[PDB]
Design a protein around this ligand. Structure first.
Ligand code: GTP
Ligand code: ACP
Ligand code: GDP
Ligand code: V95
Ligand code: CA
Ligand code: CA
Ligand code: CA
Ligand code: CL
Ligand code: MG
Ligand code: MG
Ligand code: MG
Ligand code: MG
Ligand code: MG
Lengths: 439, 421, 61, 329
């Protein structure tokens, strides 16, 4: 058994982290006080769920998690929340004033004075690990802390843990649910500084989650609470192989092996189905073929783009519920004859498939209905580069006038880092293109 | 704990400031004695932003400054006069004679250190100081001259704290003396350098609104001030009440100020005060020039950034729809090089006597019309060096006026740069 | 359309379906962090110098 | 009020469409790079499809189908027909074609040899060469496709002259296929000589303009006249002898690529107008020549067609305050 340490940075990372650990406890039968009746090895054990939970002599199962934010309001909701007993003070790190949506403030100004503390609290968890795999890092692109401090943290984790893998869960900025205008700057700045240090990153566009909540859950104005419960489900589907018995994606290294042939192109597209409103008294349970076909409808992707006009490098299918290989292969064969699924000529045209019989767990009183089978597809398609093109274009419009740039220079950043990061993104967009492409 | 320190200087500054504390004290359930008597804990969730907690009493974190005692004596006997900490009344006796030099160099210099001592004591008792806000006029001597002196001293001692101002711009329509363009021109350059936000409250606009819209044949300064206190309440709503936004002054400024010197905002309010307004009416009104308090036509310029907070119970799917319709109506009046530069926020608590309201904060290049107006009045007198003796008699030099004039013209040309870009 | 590497357990199973064959050091980090702090210190000193020149003028008036 | 932008100033068709929209009073044009639009009249090359459908609350529509180039490039069309089972190499209405890079060189010669006692005339194009000898065609190229030249074209009388049929087809956001009732024949003014001289072999409007204008105004015969000619000369109608095949070919091509280009459940919507070029042989069999993704219209038909675009493609999505034949599928 090898442990994984989750790190939650900024408001988005912390609130999403809180929603995931709630779901984790429900899936593993862990109660808010941290007790796990089904666990018979009191105070220890090397079960699959111990990759995310440590155990105390009193029987409490403690998340291997560290929450970091530069202001306390959000992490205070964890200290006083339903699962307060689950964590202990040394896991929750708060500053006094935040980065004010300013990457430079999160990376340089305020980051320098707290980076040593965070690494120490991470070392305390790493010291309890017999064999640490690496880190799962949750953060937003748009926040000054989520963007600025995360990139600094990722740099130092590559130094203090050169062998450990690092996976990201990143929230891509959507103006529908944002009152900021500088997030294109912060996104490009943090992607540039973090690219070399991340082995596999799962981008989630709030635009996509927002519309899925509106269209499939009948929520007229989705809140962060609505978005996060849906995001937590998808994160759970991605990390379930690390927390349950299985043979697919059982360690962070397999994520790169199975999803990232080229290191810089490490942003797999996630697609999830089915998302069913709990208000629907009864819903016709969807078949394996129907949920698998739904993995190729752009409306169900975590990032809105068109994989038909790109090329695949890898594709993983993660099923939860009543699913058997027979029905999976039957669905794939049918979907090949109806969908445009083109792989690169230097990869096999196949699907790695994992099935966990336990069906998706849902938060009591939430917006999601219980389903007998669900699937999350992880596909590394070049079509996700449409998200970089959108972001880089917004960057270009503002930076051509140096709009807001003085805020970053005022915190010690140099104007050259802007163009330095933008040029890295321009190379990233070309890498994707090389791989994917009056009368 | 994200504290804000409030300063009010001079006659105008203290009279709008007093009304501001009356309004929000009522919104937070604080009575003229400083005792809480509300029916919702939301009133107290962010009470510490503007109030210190004493016998379960809440005391405004407010400093009252003037060079004559008259206006502050009137505040101390006013409705909410007793809630202010007596030690925070800092006043001289000589007055400023509507003279920027008296406020900035002579009379004000003798009093400024005393004001900073109170500012320091209030800042010391702050767990985490967000920054400062100042209320003042630019056309007098104390608020304009000593107010900008205080801002310069505060930045020297607190260089990493936000400084925002609510600044009343003079107008011949509503004027006390002819030297107001001199005092305003001298003050604007100070604000260009040492404030992060300046809400430009034009007395011409406040008068036109009272006369043409509110049907008040003879507006008083009190009538103009009801518009200012109401606008100030809305502008500070996201700092004082729980809701969508929990941004501090710095984050709010970051998303509104793309260039350090172009931080002069056009505020607006709706409804202008039994039929509760529909959401389309709130939205259309807050973008109408007739609801804007800078006396600038937004159709003569372009918006760099816009922020609008809606207060009360309402459908926000309906607000999003109307904000789209008004943007389409004014599509050529928003810069195209700041994506998503129109943002909206909500608060469930409405102000007193309204089921719902909206407050507009526009960073428009049309504000240059206001500076050009002041600059033209300035030059009309300065060509002939008229009334300059009031200033040279306090040690000022002609060159300082020439430099303020040029600084004003540079500010106006910088706005015209981004209005064509 | 072959199935390979089928692994079964009590919790589930996994397999593959093939349809067709085909860093900076700590020192350098502290350097850049300290280089930014000194650009902040220099810019702040220019502000205080600018304000000090303003104090001189106030005394001269 | 609806908004739209223009990014192809060289388009005669959508220059009239923009004028018609402005003339309704309910449409307001914006600047080329303004992203808050309802309708994009996009450019021909490198259209930024990845930036569409990401503006909050705005329904966005574009006048081009992403991926339709596979049908509108001569080399891509050959590959699309031969590799798609819906069409297949056994396709009966597309001339025998091969892609050659300066590929299908070995297989092109194999069929070329099997012909050698069939007529063995071919045409290569991407710039056009017609020759009986293969070596002249292969060596001439030194991306192109070699296509069997149709040696027995239907020749109009009087004139003994060649022609091709242009059909305009509008595909809306619901993937309804609309065939403009009015087509046009681009005729050759010179007589067809089966015996290098490409005045009577190439029927392009520019090649004829550069006997022109003798038989009909501008070498443009419209369906009414061409129909009457078929009734008088050959005792048949345009509907029975040609249009049935044209409609079948249009539907086959577009339904084949529907899953690849459809915007049914996309975050943005697409429509596009296509120009299908057909050829008729002396036995009244219709052959597909090419499909044009950015075609112009006949001067007489600009007004009627452009109005149809607004009614069916634009106002269908953005309503205000038939000339098409619907090919059902
Ligand atoms: N999905 C989701 N997105 C969030 C959440 N909270 C914030 N965001 C997004 O994150 C971006 C803003 O960054 P934040 O994470 O709130 O800011 P931060 O990381 O705390 O950094 P600073 O506050 O500037 O110091 C916006 O695009 C928000 O839409 C959340 O709970 N869920
Ligand atoms: N296989 C073929 N058989 C007979 N004639 C052919 C032919 N291929 C081309 N032609 C003739 O040559 C002319 C020009 O060829 P083609 O249509 O490929 O050029 P083009 O792409 O420029 C047409 P447009 O101007 O509409 O874009 C055709 O209109 C046709 O008359
Ligand atoms: N809105 C408003 N403006 C005022 C008030 N009192 C004065 N003014 C304006 O402020 C300017 C005079 O400045 P004032 O504050 O009286 O001088 P000071 O006391 O030396 O700062 C003129 O432009 C007046 O129109 C007031 O109560 N309300
Ligand atoms: C004491 O000085 C201040 O209050 N300064 C100040 N600056 C502000 C900027 C914006 C807002 C908003 O209400 C808002 C509305 C929608 C989106 C984002 C923000 C409020 C502000 N208050
Ligand atoms: Ca155990
Ligand atoms: Ca590494
Ligand atoms: Ca004295
Ligand atoms: Cl290591
Ligand atoms: Mg934060
Ligand atoms: Mg650099
Ligand atoms: Mg006065
Ligand atoms: Mg002293
Ligand atoms: Mg063509």
């Amino acid at each position: 058994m090898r442990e994984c340490i989750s790190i939650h940075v900024g408001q988005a990372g912390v609130q999403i982290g809180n929603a995931c650990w709630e779901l984790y406890c429900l899936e593993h039968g862990i109660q808010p006080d941290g007790q796990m009746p089904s666990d018979k090895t009191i105070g220890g054990g090397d079960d699959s769920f111990n990759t995310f939970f440590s155990e105390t002599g009193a029987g409490k199962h403690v998340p291997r998690a560290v929450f970091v934010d530069l202001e306390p309001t959000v992490i205070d909701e964890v200290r006083t929340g339903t699962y307060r007993q689950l964590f202990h003070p040394e896991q929750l790190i708060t500053g006094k004033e935040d980065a004010a949506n300013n990457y430079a403030r999160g990376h340089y100004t305020i980051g320098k004075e707290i980076i040593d503390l965070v690494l120490d609290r991470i070392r305390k968890l790493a010291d309890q690990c017999t064999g640490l795999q690496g880190f799962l890092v949750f953060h937003s692109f748009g926040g000054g802390t989520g963007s600025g401090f995360t990139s600094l943290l990722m740099e130092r984790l590559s130094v203090d843990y050169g062998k450990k893998s690092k996976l990201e869960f990143s929230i891509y900025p959507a103006p529908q649910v944002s009152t900021a205008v500088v997030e294109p700057y912060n996104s490009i700045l943090t992607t540039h500084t973090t690219l070399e240090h991340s082995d596999c990153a799962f981008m989630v566009d709030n635009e996509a989650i927002y519309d899925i909540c509106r269209r499939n859950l009948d929520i007229e104005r989705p809140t962060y609470t609505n978005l996060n419960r849906l995001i937590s489900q998808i994160v759970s589907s991605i990390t379930a192989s690390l927390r349950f018995d299985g043979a697919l994606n059982v360690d962070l290294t397999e994520f790169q092996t199975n999803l990232v042939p080229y290191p810089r192109i490490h942003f797999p597209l996630a697609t999830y189905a089915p998302v069913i409103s709990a208000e629907k008294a009864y819903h016709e349970q969807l078949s394996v073929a129907e949920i698998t076909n739904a993995c190729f409808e752009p409306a169900n992707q975590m990032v809105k783009c068109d994989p038909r006009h790109g090329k695949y490098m890898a594709c993983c299918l993660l099923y939860r519920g009543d699913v058997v290989p027979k029905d999976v292969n039957a669905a794939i064969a049918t979907i090949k004859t109806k969908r445009s699924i083109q792989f690169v000529d230097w990869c096999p045209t196949g699907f790695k498939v994992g099935i966990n019989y336990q069906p998706p767990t849902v938060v009591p009183g939430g917006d999601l209905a219980k389903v007998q089978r669900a699937v999350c597809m992880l596909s590394n398609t070049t079509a996700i580069a449409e998200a970089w093109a959108r972001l880089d274009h917004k960057f270009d419009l503002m930076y051509a006038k140096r709009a807001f740039v003085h805020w970053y220079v005022g915190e010690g950043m140099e104007e050259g880092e802007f163009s330095e990061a933008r040029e890295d993104m321009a190379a990233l967009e070309k890498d994707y293109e090389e791989v994917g492409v009056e009368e | 704990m994200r504290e804000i320190v409030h300063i009010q200087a001079g006659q105008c500054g203290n009279q709008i400031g007093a009304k501001f504390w009356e309004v929000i004290s009522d919104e937070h359930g604080i009575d003229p004695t400083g005792s809480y008597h509300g029916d919702s804990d939301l009133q107290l969730e962010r009470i510490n932003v503007y109030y210190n907690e004493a016998g379960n009493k809440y005391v405004p974190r407010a400093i009252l400054v003037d060079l004559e005692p008259g206006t502050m004596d009137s505040v101390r006997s006013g409705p909410f006069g007793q809630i202010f900490r007596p030690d925070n009344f800092v006043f001289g006796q000589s007055g400023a004679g509507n003279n920027w030099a008296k406020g900035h160099y002579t009379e004000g210099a003798e009093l400024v250190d005393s004001v900073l001592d109170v500012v320091r004591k209030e800042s010391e008792s702050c767990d985490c100081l967000q920054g400062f806000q100042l209320t003042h006029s630019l056309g007098g001597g104390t608020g304009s001259g000593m107010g900008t002196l205080l801002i310069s001293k505060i930045r020297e001692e607190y260089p990493d704290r936000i400084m925002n101002t609510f600044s009343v711009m003079p107008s011949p329509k509503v004027s006390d003396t002819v030297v107001e363009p001199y005092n305003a021109t001298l003050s604007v350059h100070q604000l260009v350098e040492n404030t992060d936000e300046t809400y430009c409250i034009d007395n011409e606009a406040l008068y036109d609104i009272c006369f043409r819209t509110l049907k008040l044949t003879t507006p008083t300064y009190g009538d103009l001030n009801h518009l200012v206190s109401a606008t100030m309440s809305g502008v500070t709503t996201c700092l004082r009440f729980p809701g969508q936004l929990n941004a501090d002054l710095r984050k709010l400024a970051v998303n509104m100020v793309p260039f350090p010197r172009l931080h002069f905002f056009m505020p607006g309010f709706a409804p202008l005060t039994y039929r509760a307004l529909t959401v389309p009416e709130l939205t259309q009104q807050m973008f109408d020039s007739k609801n804007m308090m800078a006396a600038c036509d937004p159709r003569h310029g372009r918006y760099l950034t816009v922020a609008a907070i809606f207060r009360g119970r309402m459908s926000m799917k309906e607000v999003d729809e109307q904000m789209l319709n008004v943007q389409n109506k004014n599509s050529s009046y928003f810069v195209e090089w700041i994506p998503n530069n129109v943002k909206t926020a909500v608060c469930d608590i409405p102000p007193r006597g309204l089921k719902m309201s909206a407050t507009f904060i526009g960073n428009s290049t049309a504000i240059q019309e206001l500076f050009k107006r002041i600059s033209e009045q300035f030059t009309a007198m300065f060509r002939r060096k008229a009334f300059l003796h009031w200033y040279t008699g306090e040690g000022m030099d002609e060159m300082e006026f020439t430099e303020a004039e040029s600084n004003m013209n540079d500010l106006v040309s910088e706005y015209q740069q981004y209005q064509d870009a | 359309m072959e199935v390979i590497e089928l692994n079964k357990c009590t919790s589930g199973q996994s397999f593959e379906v093939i349809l067709k064959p085909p860093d900076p050091s700590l020192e350098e980090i502290q350097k850049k962090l300290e280089a930014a702090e000194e650009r902040r210190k220099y810019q702040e000193a220019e502000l205080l110098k600018h304000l000090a020149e303003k104090r001189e003028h106030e005394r001269e008036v | 009020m609806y908004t739209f932008v223009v990014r192809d100033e060289n388009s005669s068709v959508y220059a009239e469409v923009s004028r018609l929209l402005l003339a309704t009073g309910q449409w307001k044009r914006l600047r080329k790079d303004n992203p808050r639009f309802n309708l994009m009249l996009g450019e021909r090359n490198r259209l930024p499809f990845g930036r569409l459908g990401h503006e909050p609350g705005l329904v966005q529509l574009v006048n081009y189908y992403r991926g339709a180039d596979k049908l509108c490039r001569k080399a891509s069309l050959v590959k699309l027909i031969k590799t798609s089972p819906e069409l297949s190499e056994s396709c009966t209405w597309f001339p025998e074609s091969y892609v050659i890079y300066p590929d299908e060189r070995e297989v092109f010669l194999a069929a070329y040899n099997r012909r050698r006692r069939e007529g063995n005339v071919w045409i290569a194009k991407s710039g056009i060469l017609i020759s009986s000898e293969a070596s002249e065609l292969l060596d001439f190229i030194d991306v192109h496709v070699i296509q069997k030249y149709l040696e027995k074209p239907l020749l109009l009388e009087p004139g003994h002259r060649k022609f091709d049929i242009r059909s305009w087809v509008l595909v809306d956001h619901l993937y309804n296929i609309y065939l403009y009732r009015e087509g046009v024949l681009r005729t050759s003014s010179e007589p067809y000589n089966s015996a290098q001289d490409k005045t009577c072999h190439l029927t392009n409007h520019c090649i004829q303009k550069e006997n022109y204008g003798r038989y009909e105004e501008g070498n443009e015969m419209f369906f009414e006249e061409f129909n009457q000619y078929l009734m008088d000369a050959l005792n048949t109608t345009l509907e029975n002898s040609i249009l049935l095949q044209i409609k079948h070919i249009i539907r086959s091509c577009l339904m084949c690529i529907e899953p690849a280009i459809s915007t049914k459940h996309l975050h943005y919507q697409s429509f596009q107008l296509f120009g299908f070029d057909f050829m008729v042989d002396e036995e009244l069999k219709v052959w597909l020549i090419e499909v044009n993704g950015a075609p112009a219209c006949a001067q007489k038909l600009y007004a009627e067609l452009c109005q149809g675009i607004v009614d069916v493609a634009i106002s269908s999505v953005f309503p205000l305050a038939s000339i098409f034949i619907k090919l059902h599928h």
